[PDB]
Amino acid sequence: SMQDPIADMLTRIRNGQAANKAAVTMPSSKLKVAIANVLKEEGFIEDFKVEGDTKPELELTLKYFQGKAVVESIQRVSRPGLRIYKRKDELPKVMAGLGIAVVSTSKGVMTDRAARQAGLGGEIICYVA
Amino acid sequence: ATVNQLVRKPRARKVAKSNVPALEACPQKRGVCTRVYTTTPKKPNSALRKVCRVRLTNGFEVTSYIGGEGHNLQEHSVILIRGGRVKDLPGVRYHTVRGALDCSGVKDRKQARSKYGVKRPK
RNA sequence: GGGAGAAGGCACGCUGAUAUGUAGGUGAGGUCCCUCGCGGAUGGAGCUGAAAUCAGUCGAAGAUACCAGCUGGCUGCAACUGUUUAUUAAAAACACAGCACUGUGCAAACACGAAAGUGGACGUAUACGGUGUGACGCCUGCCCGGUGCCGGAAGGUUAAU
RNA sequence: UUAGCUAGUAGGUGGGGUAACGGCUCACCUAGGCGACGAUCCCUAGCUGGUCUGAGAGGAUGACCAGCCACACUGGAACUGAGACACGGUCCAGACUCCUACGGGAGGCAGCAGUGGGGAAUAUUGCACAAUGGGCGCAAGCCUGAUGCAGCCAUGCCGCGUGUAUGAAGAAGGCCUUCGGGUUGUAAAGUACUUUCAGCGGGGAGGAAGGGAGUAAAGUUAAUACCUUUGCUCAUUGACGUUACCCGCAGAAGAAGCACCGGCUAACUCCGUGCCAGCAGCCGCGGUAAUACGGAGGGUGCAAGCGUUAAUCGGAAUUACUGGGCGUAAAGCGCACGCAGGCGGUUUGUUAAGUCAGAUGUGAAAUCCCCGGGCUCAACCUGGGAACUGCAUCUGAUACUGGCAAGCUUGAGUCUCGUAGAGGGGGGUAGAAUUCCAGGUGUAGCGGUGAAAUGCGUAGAGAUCUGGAGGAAUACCGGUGGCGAAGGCGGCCCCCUGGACGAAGACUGACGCUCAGGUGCGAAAGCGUGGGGAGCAAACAGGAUUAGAUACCCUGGUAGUCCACGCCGUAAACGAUGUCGACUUGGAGGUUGUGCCCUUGAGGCGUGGCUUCCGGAGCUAACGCGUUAAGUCGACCGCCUGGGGA
RNA sequence: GAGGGCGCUUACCACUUUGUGAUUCAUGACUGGGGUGAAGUCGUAACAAGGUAACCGUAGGGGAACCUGCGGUUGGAUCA
Ligand SMILES: [Mg+2]
Ligand SMILES: [Mg+2]
Ligand SMILES: [Mg+2]
Ligand SMILES: [Mg+2]
Ligand SMILES: [Mg+2]
Numbered sequence A: 001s002m003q004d005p006i007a008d009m010l011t012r013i014r015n016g017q018a019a020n021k022a023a024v025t026m027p028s029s030k031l032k033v034a035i036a037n038v039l040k041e042e043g044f045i046e047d048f049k050v051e052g053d054t055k056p057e058l059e060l061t062l063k064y065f066q067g068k069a070v071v072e073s074i075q076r077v078s079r080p081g082l083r084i085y086k087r088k089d090e091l092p093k094v095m096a097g098l099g100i101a102v103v104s105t106s107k108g109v110m111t112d113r114a115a116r117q118a119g120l121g122g123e124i125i126c127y128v129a
Numbered sequence B: 001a002t003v004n005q006l007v008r009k010p011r012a013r014k015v016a017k018s019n020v021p022a023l024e025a026c027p028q029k030r031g032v033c034t035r036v037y038t039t040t041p042k043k044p045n046s047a048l049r050k051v052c053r054v055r056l057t058n059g060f061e062v063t064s065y066i067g068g069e070g071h072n073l074q075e076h077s078v079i080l081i082r083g084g085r086v087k088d089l090p091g092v093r094y095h096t097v098r099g100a101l102d103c104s105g106v107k108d109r110k111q112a113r114s115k116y117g118v119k120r121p122k
Numbered sequence C: 001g002g003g004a005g006a007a008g009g010c011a012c013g014c015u016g017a018u019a020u021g022u023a024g025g026u027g028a029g030g031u032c033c034c035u036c037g038c039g040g041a042u043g044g045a046g047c048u049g050a051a052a053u054c055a056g057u058c059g060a061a062g063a064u065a066c067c068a069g070c071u072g073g074c075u076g077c078a079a080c081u082g083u084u085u086a087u088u089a090a091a092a093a094c095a096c097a098g099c100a101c102u103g104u105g106c107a108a109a110c111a112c113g114a115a116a117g118u119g120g121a122c123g124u125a126u127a128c129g130g131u132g133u134g135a136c137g138c139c140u141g142c143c144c145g146g147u148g149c150c151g152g153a154a155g156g157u158u159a160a161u
Numbered sequence D: 001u002u003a004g005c006u007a008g009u010a011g012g013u014g015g016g017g018u019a020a021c022g023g024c025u026c027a028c029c030u031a032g033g034c035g036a037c038g039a040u041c042c043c044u045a046g047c048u049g050g051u052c053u054g055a056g057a058g059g060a061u062g063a064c065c066a067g068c069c070a071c072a073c074u075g076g077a078a079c080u081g082a083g084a085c086a087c088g089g090u091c092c093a094g095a096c097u098c099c100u101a102c103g104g105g106a107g108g109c110a111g112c113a114g115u116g117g118g119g120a121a122u123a124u125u126g127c128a129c130a131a132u133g134g135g136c137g138c139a140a141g142c143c144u145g146a147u148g149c150a151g152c153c154a155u156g157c158c159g160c161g162u163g164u165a166u167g168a169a170g171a172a173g174g175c176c177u178u179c180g181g182g183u184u185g186u187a188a189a190g191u192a193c194u195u196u197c198a199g200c201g202g203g204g205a206g207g208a209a210g211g212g213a214g215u216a217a218a219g220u221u222a223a224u225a226c227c228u229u230u231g232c233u234c235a236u237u238g239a240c241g242u243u244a245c246c247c248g249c250a251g252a253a254g255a256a257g258c259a260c261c262g263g264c265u266a267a268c269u270c271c272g273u274g275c276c277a278g279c280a281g282c283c284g285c286g287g288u289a290a291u292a293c294g295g296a297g298g299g300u301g302c303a304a305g306c307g308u309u310a311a312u313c314g315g316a317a318u319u320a321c322u323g324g325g326c327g328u329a330a331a332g333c334g335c336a337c338g339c340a341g342g343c344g345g346u347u348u349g350u351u352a353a354g355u356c357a358g359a360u361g362u363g364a365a366a367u368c369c370c371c372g373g374g375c376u377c378a379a380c381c382u383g384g385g386a387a388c389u390g391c392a393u394c395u396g397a398u399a400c401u402g403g404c405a406a407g408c409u410u411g412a413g414u415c416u417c418g419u420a421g422a423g424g425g426g427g428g429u430a431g432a433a434u435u436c437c438a439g440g441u442g443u444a445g446c447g448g449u450g451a452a453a454u455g456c457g458u459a460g461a462g463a464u465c466u467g468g469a470g471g472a473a474u475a476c477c478g479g480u481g482g483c484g485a486a487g488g489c490g491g492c493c494c495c496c497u498g499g500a501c502g503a504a505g506a507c508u509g510a511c512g513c514u515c516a517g518g519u520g521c522g523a524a525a526g527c528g529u530g531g532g533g534a535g536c537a538a539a540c541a542g543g544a545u546u547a548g549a550u551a552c553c554c555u556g557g558u559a560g561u562c563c564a565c566g567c568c569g570u571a572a573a574c575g576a577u578g579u580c581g582a583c584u585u586g587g588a589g590g591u592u593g594u595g596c597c598c599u600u601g602a603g604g605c606g607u608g609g610c611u612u613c614c615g616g617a618g619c620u621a622a623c624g625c626g627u628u629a630a631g632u633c634g635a636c637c638g639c640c641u642g643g644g645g646a
Numbered sequence E: 001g002a003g004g005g006c007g008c009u010u011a012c013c014a015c016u017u018u019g020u021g022a023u024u025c026a027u028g029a030c031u032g033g034g035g036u037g038a039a040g041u042c043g044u045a046a047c048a049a050g051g052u053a054a055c056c057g058u059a060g061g062g063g064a065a066c067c068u069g070c071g072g073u074u075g076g077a078u079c080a
């Protein structure tokens, strides 16, 4: 039973990067598009696009820099069954600022750094390094 | 394993028992000698190590070991049992700290006198 | 299923209230209906009538007379009810349900019968007789040397004729 | 390895009672209340701010002090009093102690000191109310074993000193010595210098603020009387106190010990025994030198302390939430169903519980940390700040989880047409073969073994034929072929029936996954009853081997293996790999279905399910897994924490 | 006289007493198993194809390791 779509997306992109794939098509979602927007903004991916009327499908394009995959480690944090909620003071920092610790809060899902800048906490979604 | 299983059954500790049961969290215990004798240690070691079956004042009766060279212990002697085991002596778990009420210090010793109750030479 | 009425303990007289007799039971007369009588719905008039609560009261004693279990623990035997020496032994003695063996194909075995015949049985191998042990749980381990029983007539002996 | 507890107990009606609400209690009514989110029961335990360890998370803990609670020889009770069921107030009961003239009476130091007893271990029968309070009093004034101090203890922390510049004949002596030298060693002697601290003789702040005796102004008041307030100078009050502190005396005096030296760990050389004495925290040492025991030299470390013991934590990621594993080191229940519980595809609307931001109250004081100050300095004290990571309330957000509502099929499931299969249950029938029964031929052997023998034979054994009886399973098919959740299923037919897969469709609409407790199935062996029993075959007998053989070799041979109905839930029940969803290079096959192309031949291209062998990345301690992963993740359950004991 | 004291009684009630259960501790003739050891006695069961392949569940038997039958595994070596 598919009980976590975010984990499925992370697994798909991590396997595509390992297998040196070009595009990873998957069934999309509102949160998937919101996370893909953050990935495009942070430059960890190359492009994301939602193509579908009745069943929307996200087709992300993998980004490669001199052979090495741009994303080093993708990790789910607040998996279903263990929810993590940290305030503004205790927001995580991935790889001493070299990685993102994406946070979802009231003002959308922008990123950990933007959440700290705005002064609001939230729930951790994905660690991308 | 899983967080739900941990919440259900807590990650319990593992209580370890002390190696000096007859002390009851006490450094020294005064007792009276009952059986003074010598025993042969386990192989490959071989000796005539001097031990003593002594009954403590709390009620426990254990066997301790006499250190140094030469002692004046016998039946109906008051000694001060101290916590410490001997590896090559099966059953011995304690010693008799010298300089106590009756177990005098070792004779003709001028090094490590703190552990054997020997006075400072003049 | 039982031990068990285990052991042990509490109240028991009388009077007055609840209730001038209660809960309950029986059950009048007057409306009703009949395809009308020994009838069918209401009715509690009358009679009978527990059990308990509260208070008071008299005696040393209120299941006050008669009648009317002493109790527990260990242990051998027999499972148990029962039966047994009329008239000194009622028991561990017999029987018992259960178990095992054996014989028995019906005109059955067996028994009473000189015999007819009968019982078994107006039954038919889940039926009947005999012999051992004797509810139930764990089981019935070795031996045919000897005496019985069953199967054989290759050989030896063997009556009457 | 504590699954039920409670009959004033749940609640209600009415009355009585405390300062009030209250089964606080009685009198009636409704049988409820608590409990797998641990009721009830057992053991232990004062709680907290705090303390120690740890980077943190955590673990242990409650010394001093502070706040709360409970108790005054033990149990019960009540009175006064605002305030108690009251440490030195009351009564009774039990024990102890002590007077009695035997009728009778007195006491409770877990208060401050001290005594007896216990223990490894706890200190004086000290001064003062001078300061702070408390109690009483208009005030003076009285009491305080609170308190302020005095004495002992290295019990804990900190500071100081126990000298110093030198000083080579590298004095002397000691130690070993390759006997030429080295070590102690600038160490010591000697010289110059200082006198901290201790002793002597003196000065000597400060903790002391007030109070009484007098004089004035104001406030009163008929009244400067009387009183209060405000001031004013004088006479006054100290346990510490031989006060802190400073000054001069003279001399280096009056002051250093403890542990270790093979590795962990900082430090090596000789002498003495000789697995003896002995060391020991682990590895381990002592059997003529073990740098490991004892002695010496030397060095190492700390220092008025040094080591051991007692206890906690780190290391121990060795209970892992931070921060682990289950194929083989310990770890997937034998399998399936399923309750509670956990999680949950996709879109929108509503709310704001979880979440987030701000503010308020609070989180006592003491304590940690930061910035400063005072004792000559530190320990110590102190001011401010921070912190107390927590809770409650109010105000705003819906991205996410959850509550509600309205939609979708991509998850799940149904119908329609077909396909394969030893899937399960029940009943029949064919055949080979084995074993018996009877008969016909039939003559000296048969069977068996490494070798024989027990065993079967002239009473006709073994061989063959004929006829008949009985039980089991179905030679070839037959394959890493097929099915089944697992266990497991194989001649053929008949009846019932479960499950699985495929082209093209239609349909409900999250109905989905896991699942402690529970339920069901479940190899063989085993047990009970009723049957049957051909062959095989535990136990058992005999023969054989062996020094011995209660066994492997052989001949018999009962239970059992065959059937029906019942009990257990045991296997290396294995793929030593739990159930479900998604992704990840490839090759060579087996089985089963379907689509298309000219199917002239299992010609060619595709497309789903199961299954088999290699093999890339990746993983793993490695064997090995490798699209059916042991590669990366998601949801859940079960299990593991050294080997024995077990 | 009201009302209050002494006495008496009733209700609650401590000490104490009776019977029967539950749990824990110590002891107890005798008895089973387990762990330690020194030149003690018997056998060779496992490790090779350990010389009868091992191992598991079960039942029986034996002084003992073990043996046998049934069902499963290769965590057995050779090999048509
Ligand atoms: Mg009536
Ligand atoms: Mg007798
Ligand atoms: Mg008997
Ligand atoms: Mg009888
Ligand atoms: Mg008689």
Ligand SMILES: [Mg+2]
Pocket (backbone or CB within 6 Å): C090
């Ligand atoms: Mg009789």
Ligand SMILES: [Mg+2]
Pocket (backbone or CB within 6 Å): none
């Ligand atoms: Mg008899």
Ligand SMILES: [Mg+2]
Pocket (backbone or CB within 6 Å): none
């Ligand atoms: Mg017999």
Ligand SMILES: [Mg+2]
Pocket (backbone or CB within 6 Å): C144
């Ligand atoms: Mg005979």
Ligand SMILES: [Mg+2]
Pocket (backbone or CB within 6 Å): none
């Ligand atoms: Mg005969």
Ligand SMILES: [Mg+2]
Pocket (backbone or CB within 6 Å): none
């Ligand atoms: Mg009541």
Ligand SMILES: [Mg+2]
Pocket (backbone or CB within 6 Å): none
């Ligand atoms: Mg820890």
Ligand SMILES: [Mg+2]
Pocket (backbone or CB within 6 Å): none
């Ligand atoms: Mg006392």
Ligand SMILES: [Mg+2]
Pocket (backbone or CB within 6 Å): none
């Ligand atoms: Mg009190």
Ligand SMILES: [Mg+2]
Pocket (backbone or CB within 6 Å): none
């Ligand atoms: Mg005292």
Ligand SMILES: [Mg+2]
Pocket (backbone or CB within 6 Å): D129
């Ligand atoms: Mg005072």
Ligand SMILES: [Mg+2]
Pocket (backbone or CB within 6 Å): none
């Ligand atoms: Mg010299």
Ligand SMILES: [Mg+2]
Pocket (backbone or CB within 6 Å): D262
């Ligand atoms: Mg060492």
Ligand SMILES: [Mg+2]
Pocket (backbone or CB within 6 Å): D324, D325
């Ligand atoms: Mg581990």
Ligand SMILES: [Mg+2]
Pocket (backbone or CB within 6 Å): none
């Ligand atoms: Mg193993």
Ligand SMILES: [Mg+2]
Pocket (backbone or CB within 6 Å): none
């Ligand atoms: Mg294992």
